Amino acid sequence: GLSDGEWQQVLNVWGKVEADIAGHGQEVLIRLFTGHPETLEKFDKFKHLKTEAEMKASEDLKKHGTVVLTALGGILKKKGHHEAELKPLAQSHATKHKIPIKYLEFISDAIIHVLHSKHPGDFGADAQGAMTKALELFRNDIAAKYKELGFQ
Ligand code: HEM
């Protein structure tokens, strides 16, 4: 549940991500993998990445960063009316990829970190608040589909 003003802040912030979707995507995943090494083990196609140099040097990691943020952006543009978009992602990540809701908390915090890192002093207190709310809404609606499936 976000206000109209809050949704406007979220979509304003997203303009930054849209100027460099791959760069933001790559940094969000690198921050996830480096901060939480177990998350890398969920990706059979990125397990071979033994170093952050290998990570930064991976074209396919950049590619998947674009896939992830494009999907998230689509959802954010629905301003909460995202059932059709979110349900299949929830179901894929629980049933096929086996991703605990904890890892979605990790990637949420990682998005906040990357925005401050790439835009220092240009990601204000109101902006962080609005983006956090959106990411919690997203996370919480996925958690609901996880409880439905009894997935832990
Ligand atoms: C902001 C949250 C995220 C979004 C928007 C997102 C989105 C996506 C999309 C669109 C795909 C491809 C289609 C599909 O399989 O459903 C995908 C694949 C996948 N996701 Fe995510 N995802 C998120 C978070 C996570 C996290 C936190 C992990 C792991 C720690 C994860 C692991 C995977 C894996 C293992 C695949 C398959 C990669 C492959 O082999 O091609 N995801 N994701």
Side-chain angles (χ1 to χ4, degrees), residues 93-114:
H93 285 61
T95 310
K96 198 192 194 306
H97 311 317
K98 325 301 193 166
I99 309 302
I101 191 79
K102 190 76 171 179
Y103 291 2
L104 305 189
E105 183 192 348
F106 292 165
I107 200 169
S108 295
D109 292 337
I111 286 162
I112 294 307
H113 174 84
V114 174

Side-chain angles (χ1 to χ4, degrees), residues 2 15 20 25 31 46 49 52-53 63 72 92 98 116 151:
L2 278 75
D20 186 13
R31 170 76 177 186
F46 303 131
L49 291 179
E52 176 174 350
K63 184 182 187 182
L72 175 63
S92 186
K98 325 301 193 166
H116 277 299
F151 176 73

Side-chain angles (χ1 to χ4, degrees), residues 68-79:
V68 175
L69 292 199
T70 295
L72 175 63
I75 290 168
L76 294 172
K77 293 163 198 302
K78 300 305 296 286
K79 304 193 285 174

Side-chain angles (χ1 to χ4, degrees), residues 58-147:
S58 174
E59 297 306 337
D60 201 62
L61 195 160
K62 175 178 283 199
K63 184 182 187 182
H64 199 68
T66 303
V67 167
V68 175
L69 292 199
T70 295
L72 175 63
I75 290 168
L76 294 172
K77 293 163 198 302
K78 300 305 296 286
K79 304 193 285 174
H81 298 77
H82 54 222
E83 169 74 18
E85 290 80 8
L86 185 143
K87 184 184 168 180
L89 273 182
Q91 298 202 329
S92 186
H93 285 61
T95 310
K96 198 192 194 306
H97 311 317
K98 325 301 193 166
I99 309 302
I101 191 79
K102 190 76 171 179
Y103 291 2
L104 305 189
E105 183 192 348
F106 292 165
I107 200 169
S108 295
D109 292 337
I111 286 162
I112 294 307
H113 174 84
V114 174
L115 289 164
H116 277 299
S117 189
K118 296 181 78 53
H119 313 278
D122 193 29
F123 180 38
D126 59 4
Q128 183 180 151
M131 191 45 86
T132 297
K133 278 189 78 155
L135 289 170
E136 283 170 338
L137 181 62
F138 166 80
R139 188 154 80 251
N140 195 72
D141 283 353
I142 282 164
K145 306 291 186 196
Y146 275 29
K147 179 164 174 271

Side-chain angles (χ1 to χ4, degrees), residues 13-28:
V13 170
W14 200 254
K16 305 175 147 53
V17 177
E18 293 196 322
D20 186 13
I21 186 74
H24 285 82
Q26 169 195 242
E27 290 191 35
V28 166

